[PDB]
Swiss-Prot record:
It comes from the Eukaryota. One of its GO terms (cellular component) is endoplasmic reticulum. Mn(2+) binds at K243, H263, D310. Coiled coil: none annotated. The active site is at C287. Keywords: Acetylation, Cytoplasm, Decarboxylase, Endoplasmic reticulum, Gluconeogenesis, GTP-binding, Kinase, Lyase, Manganese, Metal-binding, Nucleotide-binding, Phosphoprotein, Transferase, Ubl conjugation. Cytosolic phosphoenolpyruvate carboxykinase that catalyzes the reversible decarboxylation and phosphorylation of oxaloacetate (OAA) and acts as the rate-limiting enzyme in gluconeogenesis. Regulates cataplerosis and anaplerosis, the processes that control the levels of metabolic intermediates in the citric acid cycle. At low glucose levels, it catalyzes the cataplerotic conversion of oxaloacetate to phosphoenolpyruvate (PEP), the rate-limiting step in the metabolic pathway that produces glucose from lactate and other precursors derived from the citric acid cycle. GO terms for molecular function: carboxylic acid binding; GDP binding; GTP binding; magnesium ion binding; manganese ion binding; nucleoside diphosphate kinase activity; phosphoenolpyruvate carboxykinase (GTP) activity; phosphoenolpyruvate carboxykinase activity. One of its GO terms (biological process) is response to bacterium. Acetylated. Lysine acetylation by p300/EP300 is increased on high glucose conditions and promotes ubiquitination by UBR5; acetylation is enhanced in the presence of BAG6. Deacetylated by SIRT2. Deacetylation of Lys-90 is carried out by SIRT1 and depends on PCK1 phosphorylation levels. Phosphorylated in a GSK3B-mediated pathway; phosphorylation affects the efficiency of SIRT1-mediated deacetylation, and regulates PCK1 ubiquitination and degradation. Phosphorylation at Ser-89 by AKT1 reduces the binding affinity to oxaloacetate and promotes the protein kinase activity: phosphorylated PCK1 translocates to the endoplasmic reticulum, where it phosphorylates INSIG1 and INSIG2. This is Phosphoenolpyruvate carboxykinase, cytosolic [GTP]. It comes from Rattus norvegicus.
């Protein structure tokens, strides 16, 4: 009799599964947080189809989702307009020393992370979590990041009061009983989440979407293997396996253990000769990873296949190959801009078993968003994401710009045969890229590994303004300076077969703000060039910024009107500005934690530019 009364025994409140079936430390995790959060019910997720349909029915009954009648088992959730995206300002990492998490900025304001003390977090935690799940179900999500059972997979337990989180996590991860069995008495990442709206409600509910914007806080405690998230039900704030776990926690572990957790798509590309290579590409959010990951190549005889569109875990094998796996189980893709033109393969994926968030609904029960490129029949009407009637004449979009689809990976018609291989896929090329409207040509190749890493460090998003090194600005699990040092150390691994490093720019514009490159499926012409360069073809011309394609090295047939002078042009004047800017940025944001080799590469680039 380990108790004097009932104890912390929550058995009486279990409505799915059994606490007795849980590994000991898992049970402890549940009951400790049950005591803190005070849920009315505990639901231990098994991951079955039966559970999933019952969950969707419950949410349908609760008014939390709408069935999209035009498609097969597709659903729509509409959110509070205050809870529409992963929120960087409320995202923090707790460590003993600030500098372990983020370099100390000379300006006194860091773009590379957001550190919170243990003391401050404890106060914030205590002001948020006690009784937060009152009147709600605590769902227990046992999930594997990476192929189930594999020793490279990592397991988490997410406790959440959101059924929307459960349904999405079932798509985005491998979840259920088999995960608990794979876990045994092993280590797991502790993931705690609440929408922060205990019953009875204190503030009004908008669009049946529970959230607490004012108290929204997404915290990480890597030393405790803990992710603790409050107040948002949206994407990266709530699906804790994705950014919180597979990037922030995992990059820190990767640093300690000799691997890599990165914001990268993984694709397999096959040339007309049937030769296949795998490539990894880091672009910032909103810069087109998912379009490339799922590309339909315009060039005949070329094939692209998707391993993953968002997150990559990578490490060397015994033979020196950099091996990559997608730790996700689905795609959580931006809906607006998705079309037959921009992503035909996504269009084919998302018509069954898919959850949409903040897109518009058509009167015949279908989905709509800006950039969909499909006219509707006259008479068909649109309900916006704000649940109002909508006309193309309105002063606002029918879908939120960050509206999403959530879709099973295995459903993708071009999903790669090896997308679940526990040994991972051999990466032969790493592609960096972002939005650079000026100065940066379509593609270049790095001069060396060290130059490659410098190229990643100098990536940009948002109109070529915001620095987003390695597409990881909001995702570093630790000090950026040390992350660079970790990337640089890869060149010292004996027999390491280092991938070639490229930088792309789909976004160069002319003087009128017109895109100089067609992009999307046409980016196959760029990947072809990369493929050949990996094969060691004599197709490259040396410049101050790296190797670029020679004249006529790129297949431009079918695009005879491309302004090649402007697209591939390199200006001494522009690049002088570029180095000066990178210098100020690294001085301000990285300073004492900058590895010497990065300083050297900045000097080397400046040097080559001075000889123009
Ligand atoms: N001009 C141009 N735009 C592109 C191309 N590929 C993608 N885009 C744009 O990039 C945006 C879509 O990419 P997203 O799905 O938002 O980016 P992502 O990297 O998948 O972002 P997350 O899913 O948030 O990580 C849209 O604005 C597209 O128009 C291209 O080849 N050319
Ligand atoms: O912002 C991103 O990079 C995303 O992939 C969406 S979310 O998972 O952070 O919501
Ligand atoms: Mn009810
Ligand atoms: Mn994406
Ligand atoms: Mn992303
Ligand atoms: Na809703």
């Amino acid at each position: 009799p380990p108790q004097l009364h009932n104890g912390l025994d929550f058995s009486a409140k279990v409505i799915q599964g059994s606490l007795d079936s849980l590994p000991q430390e898992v049970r402890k995790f549940v009951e400790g947080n049950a005591q803190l959060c005070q849920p009315e019910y505990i639901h231990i997720c098994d991951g079955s189809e039966e559970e999933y349909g019952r969950l969707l029915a419950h949410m349908q009954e609760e008014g939390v989702i709408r069935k999209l009648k035009k498609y097969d088992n597709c659903w729509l959730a509409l959110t509070d307009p205050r809870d529409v995206a992963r929120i960087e300002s409320k995202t923090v990492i707790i460590t003993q020393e600030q500098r372990d998490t983020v370099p100390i900025p000379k300006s006194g304001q860091s773009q590379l992370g957001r550190w919170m003390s243990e003391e401050d977090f404890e106060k914030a935690f205590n002001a948020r979590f006690p009784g937060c799940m009152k009147g709600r179900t605590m769902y227990v999500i046992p999930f594997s990041m990476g192929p189930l059972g594999s020793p490279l997979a990592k397991i988490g337990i997410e406790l959440t009061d959101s059924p929307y989180v459960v349904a999405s996590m079932r798509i985005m991860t491998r979840m259920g009983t088999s995960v608990l069995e794979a876990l045994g008495d092993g280590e797991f990442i502790k993931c705690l989440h609440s929408v922060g709206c205990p019953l009875p409600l204190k503030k009004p509910l908008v669009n049946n979407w529970a959230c607490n914007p004012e108290l929204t806080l997404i915290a990480h405690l890597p030393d405790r293997r803990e992710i603790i998230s409050f107040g948002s039900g949206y994407g990266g704030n709530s699906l804790l396996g994705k950014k919180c776990f597979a990037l922030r926690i995992a990059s820190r572990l990767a640093k300690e253990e000799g691997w890599l957790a990165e914001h990268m798509l993984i694709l397999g590309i096959t040339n007309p000769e049937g030769k296949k290579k795998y490539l990894a590409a880091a672009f910032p959010s909103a810069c087109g990873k998912t379009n490339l990951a799922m590309m339909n190549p315009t060039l005949p005889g070329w094939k692209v296949e998707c391993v993953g569109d968002d997150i990559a875990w990578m490490k060397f094998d015994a033979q020196g190959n950099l091996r990559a796996i997608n730790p996700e189980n689905g795609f959580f893709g931006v809906a607006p801009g998705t079309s037959v033109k921009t992503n035909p393969n996504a269009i084919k994926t998302i018509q069954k078993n898919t959850i949409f968030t903040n897109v518009a609904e058509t009167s015949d029960g279908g989905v709509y968003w800006e950039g969909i490129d499909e006219p509707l029949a006259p008479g068909v009407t649109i309900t916006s994401w704000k649940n109002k009637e909508w006309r193309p004449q309105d002063e606002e979009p029918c879908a939120h710009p960050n509206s999403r689809f959530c879709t099973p990976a295995s459903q993708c018609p071009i999903i790669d045969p090896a997308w679940e291989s526990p040994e991972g896929v051999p990466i032969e090329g790493i592609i960096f890229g972002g939005r650079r409207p000026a100065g940066v040509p379509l593609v270049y190749e790095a001069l060396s590994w060290q130059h490659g890493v410098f190229v990643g460090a100098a990536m940009r998003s948002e109109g070529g303004i915001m620095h987003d090194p390695f597409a990881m600005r909001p995702f570093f699990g630790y000090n950026f300076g040390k992350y660079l040092a970790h990337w640089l150390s890869m060149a010292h691994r004996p027999a390491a077969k280092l991938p070639k490093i490229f930088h792309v720019n789909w976004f160069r514009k002319d003087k009128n703000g017109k895109f100089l490159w067609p992009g999307f499926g046409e980016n196959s012409r760029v990947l072809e060039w990369m493929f050949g360069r990996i094969e060691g073809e004599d197709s490259a011309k040396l410049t101050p910024i790296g190797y670029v394609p020679k004249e006529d090295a790129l297949n431009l047939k079918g695009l005879g009107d491309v302004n090649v002078e402007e697209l591939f042009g390199i200006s001494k004047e522009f690049w002088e500005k570029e180095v000066e800017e990178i210098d100020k940025y690294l001085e301000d944001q990285v300073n004492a934690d900058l590895p010497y080799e990065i300083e050297r590469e900045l000097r080397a680039l400046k040097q080559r530019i001075s000889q123009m």
